[PDB]
Design a protein around this nucleic acid. Structure first.
Lengths: 122, 56, 209, 114, 120, 17
RNA sequence: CGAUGUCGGCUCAUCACAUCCUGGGGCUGAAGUAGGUCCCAAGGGUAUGGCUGUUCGCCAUUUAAAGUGGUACGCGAGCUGGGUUUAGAACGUCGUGAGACAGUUCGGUCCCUAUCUGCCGUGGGCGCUGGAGAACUGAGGGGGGCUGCUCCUAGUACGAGAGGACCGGAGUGGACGCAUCACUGGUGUUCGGGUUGUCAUGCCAAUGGCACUGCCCGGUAGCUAAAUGCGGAAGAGAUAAGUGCUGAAAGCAUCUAAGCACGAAACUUGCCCCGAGAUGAGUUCUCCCUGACCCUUUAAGGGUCCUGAAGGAACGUUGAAGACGACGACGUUGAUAGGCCGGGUGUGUAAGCGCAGCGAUGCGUUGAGCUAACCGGUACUAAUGAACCGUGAGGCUUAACCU
RNA sequence: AAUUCCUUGUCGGGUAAGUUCCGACCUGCACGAAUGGCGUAAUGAUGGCCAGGCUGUCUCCACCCGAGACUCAGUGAAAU
RNA sequence: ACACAGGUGGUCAGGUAGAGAAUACCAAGGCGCUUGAGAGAACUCGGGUGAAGGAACUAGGCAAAAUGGUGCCGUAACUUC
RNA sequence: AGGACCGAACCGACUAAUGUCGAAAAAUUAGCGGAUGACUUGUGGCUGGGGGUGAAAGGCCAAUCAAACCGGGAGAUAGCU
């Protein structure tokens, strides 16, 4: 459950550490983003030596949510924070080289193969 | 919030047609003492279903 | 095709071999006995009237007792009838079991929804509440405006306002039938159905095939 | 109800070990990736147990590399295969929700040694 | 909408409601018959009759638990010594409500609640 | 029967200019 | 002018079509994707933020689109009061001055218990004709009608290449609506526990009152969303723009004059709900009543005695029904409510005693004790025998069959 | 600018986006030196702007506890 | 104007905790405020709690929430020191 | 020492809600400012209407103030309703 103005941590090592969600994509009047929905974010503070600077708008994908995800058998997965991965605004293509922390398997959409491969767990 | 014309006595009576009370018309007679009382209620002297229940 | 009358019995879930859990509503569909068969010659339309359950001997009135005795059917609670599809026929006194739902996949369940009593516009029509602060005075959940001005001069019919909510019959359609148990008279349908536990439900095959 | 209770009873499993909140537990769960089925191990601390029969469930919290992960398992679901207990926490509270705030040396609990 | 809820409010807060039943439970035990409104009498059946059930078996823990309700040593003495043995073979239903007309002051439906005793 | 005394200003101070 | 509160915002809308999207078409300087323009079409849908009091506008990022207007520039007896528009004060400017300025700043009381119409709900009365209890037909009315992306067709048709369809099928989303509590949760001042101050039960121990439930930690049932299922149709009928077949007037040609075809989210139906007060008051099934006297201004007349059935109402216990009425279950030939027994759930190892320790405290008895609304049982208490209302075969005329 | 109509002057800072705010220039319609000019620590229930924490303000409301509203008994108004 | 949630000068002023005449619970003493009984709808008023987000609300962080005591360490720009 | 600081009584009234035929012809609830002073308060005096008083608002002068109240000129006058 990520909506506008929400703080997110960064799972990758692109140099960003905290980002603000400014829009939820994928539908008109969409309220909040799910486990693996694409969102538009702005970086609020990053590494000075990183390739992404403060106050830049680029897409992102949620990988972890505090609210959690629901499994088909009724189980749920919950995390202590919300995390995302950075993107390129033209092709999804996570720019990071490695991603820290667990990643749920809900991102297996025949496309996030790069995210799951770099995921230390699942 | 306030009336523009005073309602007639006809309208007043028409509204009051539903205010009429209804008689109980359901007074039961005690089995032993034969005292009229409301159904499912003790008699004035303290009887119910024949047997005395108040003893006072 | 005809439906059946059953009683809602709580809810449960079924665990499949692949792991996914299916929430199912349990409907107790005992034998339904046909009490009257209608024909175009007399009634102008063809239908069968059925009864289910049982009633106290001293509670069924004489007009109802004679109606059941004519068909030779034991007195039950209430009466319901279903129109025929012209492709099947029935006889008075015949008993209909839940087995007819063995070959179906979607069903429509009709029942009386739970009664919420007098409900406000916010709860009834999902009206948006006004601000709770910023000067608002005694207008936190009020409906707001209900008309325009002199030019209409009236409130249009069908306006959304507070009133009775629930306690009307509603139909949930295209529900997957999960399991049918003839010997135990159970009908597991995936999803939720209107009404509370113990309420009478009408189950018929889905019409939106 | 009698009908419901009988319906749930047939779906039970009798190989559910007895565990209490605060007990370190490793739960084996089934994982499917297209056509292959594998066993995945989730080890953590039981912080809450919900007893409702067929609807009984428990939640396990583990400290991952950076942040904690809480998973709620349905006890009688086919997904869970086996439950094993390593430690026996000496807690005296039904729900250990206070462990979320705590971290580091403050998240450890004593041993029942019973 | 209070679906399936139980417990009358009686236009009182929780603390006042609890005390009022506590006193009026004690009065019923002391006198074995009292006159109250019908709604109050009905709600008392759920606080007085459990007390008699507790008094069936005499023990230190039961005595302490009984004392914590009604907060009266006279009532606790009355229980476990008379009410207990008297209802030893009685499986509930220790009370009886009898409607007795309407109160003159405000037309409250009044009723007598009295233990199934006093057959001397 | 008897005229009032307080005679407050009933009109509301809100001019529609 | 014996008073019609005049900008914005919020809530709630409704109509028009000069259509923003979706739908159907003509032409194209229409290769295809994507366009331009015009015609038909109002079923549904038709953003979130930054700046400003702003409408507007600029800017940022979304969507299929972020339509134009009417409705007292819709809506203050529905809300706000930021702008403007009282009294205070200041700046610039004008005036000798009091003061003034669609010049600018700081501050500045928004009343109303709804009689009538209207609207949303819910009842009583009578009618529908002998009465009563049920189940229906359905005139008529209302609700719903939105759509993105991915894959297959296919990398096909097209195209020098770059690029890349039409039609049809499948899957998965957003927004909206209905239902529900099995799951994940919220609430749970009626359940259990921890704990601070103080008063009290003779005192210790153990408990209760008060301090926002004293402050907190969990949590049953209900209600509930963020939770979980389902829905938008397909099909048919008659059509709009448009495309036609045959075909004369007018030897030809021509969609039209006769005749025959197709043709859209529009219209009628199909789906769901209300519905015989539909005074045009409907249909079917079942149940109950088939005793006597008199009177006259001898009438579908009135009066008296005896009988009052089906059923209803009333009263009581009540309900996942409810403002009150109403609606449902039950009233002993009884599980309707309470209690009680067992279980479940929740909280979490009661009190007492014993042991270890100088002590706080710990261990054993003990996963104990206590448990609201839940589940299955049990007449233990309360649902009294009766009274009350409701009758005694139901008009006239005509038609058809027995007599 | 408490002063500026044209005007949201121009550039920079702050925000993804700044008619507000801060800094600088001067084309000062119509600042200006005791109806005082420019600074000024401290002070202010003083005006404007930004940040952290915090939250039902809000997305979007849900449940609960009390007093009214509703029914019964008694008493019994008002504007119009 | 009322048996009116307002106003009205001085003196005495105990216990436990507390810096305290604050505050909580009490003693002496005095009171339950002159309409009640039910039900447990919308909505209004006064309060409690809340998933994920945390000013996206709004003219404006209005209102709410939050901070809150003692001792020790430590404490910037600027300054009339 | 202090028109010093925090904070009750006491004095005042910045914000919000309630209340507008209210409990009240400006109050209540929750916050808020001063609180050894240019402070606050009891009792008694003095200033009288083109006058008083005013840390100055055209404020206050018995719920009435850009000229109080009462009686009189007075049946002022009214090309107005």
């Amino acid at each position: 459950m990520i909506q506008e103005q929400t703080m997110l941590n960064v799972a990758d090592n692109s140099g960003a550490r905290r980002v603000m969600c400014i829009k939820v994509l994928g539908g008109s009047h969409r309220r909040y983003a799910g486990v693996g929905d694409i969102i538009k974010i702005t970086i609020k503070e990053a590494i000075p030596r990183g390739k992404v600077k403060k106050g830049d708008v680029l897409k992102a994908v949620v990988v972890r949510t505090k609210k959690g995800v629901r499994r088909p058998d009724g189980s749920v997965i919950r995390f202590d924070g919300n995390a995302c991965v950075l993107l390129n605004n033209n092709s999804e293509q996570p720019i990071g080289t490695r991603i820290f922390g667990p990643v749920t398997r809900e991102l297996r959409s025949e496309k996030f193969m790069k995210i799951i491969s770099l995921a230390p767990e699942v | 919030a306030v009336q523009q014309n005073k309602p007639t006595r006809s309208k007043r009576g028409m509204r009051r047609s539903h205010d009429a009370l209804t008689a109980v018309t359901s007074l039961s007679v005690d089995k032993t003492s034969g005292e009229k009382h409301l159904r499912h209620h003790i008699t004035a002297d303290g009887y119910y279903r024949g047997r005395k229940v108040i003893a006072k | 095709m005809i439906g059946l009358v059953g009683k809602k019995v709580g809810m449960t879930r079924i665990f499949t071999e692949d792991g996914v859990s299916i929430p199912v509503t349990v409907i107790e569909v005992e034998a339904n006995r046909v009490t009257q068969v209608k024909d175009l010659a007399n009634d102008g339309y063809r239908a069968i009237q059925v009864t289910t359950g049982a009633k106290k001997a001293n509670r069924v009135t004489k007009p109802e007792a004679g109606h059941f005795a004519k068909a030779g059917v034991e007195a039950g609670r209430g009466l319901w009838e279903f129109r025929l599809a012209e492709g099947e026929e029935f006889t008075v006194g015949q008993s209909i079991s839940v087995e007819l739902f063995a070959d179906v996949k979607k069903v429509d369940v009709t029942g009386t929804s739970k009664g919420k009593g007098f409900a406000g516009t916010v709860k009834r029509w999902n009206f948006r509440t006004q601000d709770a602060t910023h000067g608002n005075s005694l207008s936190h959940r009020v409906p707001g405006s209900i008309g325009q001005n002199q030019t209409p001069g009236k409130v249009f019919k069908g306006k959304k306002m507070a009133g009775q909510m629930g306690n009307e019959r509603v139909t949930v359609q295209s529900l997957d039938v999960v399991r049918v148990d003839a010997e135990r008279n159970l009908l597991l349908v995936k999803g939720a159905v209107p009404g509370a536990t113990g309420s009478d439900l009408i189950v018929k095959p889905a019409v939106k095939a | 109800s009698n009908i419901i209770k009988q319906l749930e009873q047939e779906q039970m499993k009798q190989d559910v070990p007895s565990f209490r909140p605060g007990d370190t537990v490793e739960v084996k769960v089934w994982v499917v990736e297209g056509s292959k089925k594998r066993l995945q191990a989730f080890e953590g601390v039981v912080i809450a147990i919900r007893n409702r029969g067929l609807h009984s469930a428990f939640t396990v919290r583990k400290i991952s590399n950076g942040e904690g992960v809480e998973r709620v398992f349905q006890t009688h679901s086919p997904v869970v295969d086996s439950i094993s207990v390593k430690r026996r926490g000496a807690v005296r509270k039904a729900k250990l929700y206070y462990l979320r705030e705590r971290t580091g040396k403050a998240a450890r609990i004593k041993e029942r040694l019973n | 909408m209070r679906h399936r809820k139980s417990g009358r409010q009686l236009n009182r807060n929780s603390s006042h409601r609890q005390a009022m039943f506590r006193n009026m439970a004690g009065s019923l035990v002391r006198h074995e018959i009292i006159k109250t409104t019908l709604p109050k009498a009905k709600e008392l059946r759920r606080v007085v009759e459990p007390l008699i059930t507790l008094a069936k078996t005499d023990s230190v823990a039961n005595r302490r638990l009984a004392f914590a309700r009604t907060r009266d040593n006279e009532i606790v003495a009355k229980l476990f010594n008379e009410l207990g043995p008297r209802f030893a073979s009685r499986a509930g239903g220790y009370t009886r409500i009898l409607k007795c007309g309407f109160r003159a002051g405000d037309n409250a439906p009044m009723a007598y609640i009295e233990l199934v005793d006093r057959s001397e | 029967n008897n005229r009032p005394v307080y005679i407050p200003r009933p009109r509301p101070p809100h001019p529609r200019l």
